[PDB]
């Protein structure tokens, strides 16, 4: 419901445009491969925060106790905090005061 894949920027805005506060949804960034974005219809303005997400479905495992080469977990990350996945992320934005007021429900129903 909240997980919108392949959602064009122009589309998101066109959907949130004129949408009461509380409406939010995730979408793949255009100039950011394998990166999610938090959409939120503010007071006459739809904001979009950049989020990072793992590429493939499989979660990449860690290396031996020895020095790890190019160590880069696939966990979720956003701002000065990380998360297990999008679900947890969206919840954060709804529980935090990122944009105007807190989120209510996803564009869907």
């Amino acid at each position: 419901s909240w997980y919108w894949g392949r959602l064009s920027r122009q589309e998101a805005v066109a959907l949130l445009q004129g949408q009461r506060h509380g409406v939010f949804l995730v979408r793949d960034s255009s100039t950011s491969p394998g990166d999610y974005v938090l959409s939120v219809s503010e007071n006459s303005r739809v904001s979009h925060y950049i989020i990072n997400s793992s590429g493939p479905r499989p979660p990449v495992p860690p290396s031996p106790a020895q020095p790890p080469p190019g160590v880069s977990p696939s966990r979720l990350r956003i701002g000065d905090q990380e998360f297990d996945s999008l679900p947890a992320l969206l919840e954060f934005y709804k529980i935090h005061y990122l944009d105007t007021t807190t989120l209510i429900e996803p564009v869907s129903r």
Partner: peptide
């Protein structure tokens, strides 16, 4: 220049 997105940080100088 480096303003591709918002990026929730709230720090600045």
């Amino acid at each position: 220049e480096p303003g591709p997105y918002a990026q929730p940080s709230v720090n600045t100088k």
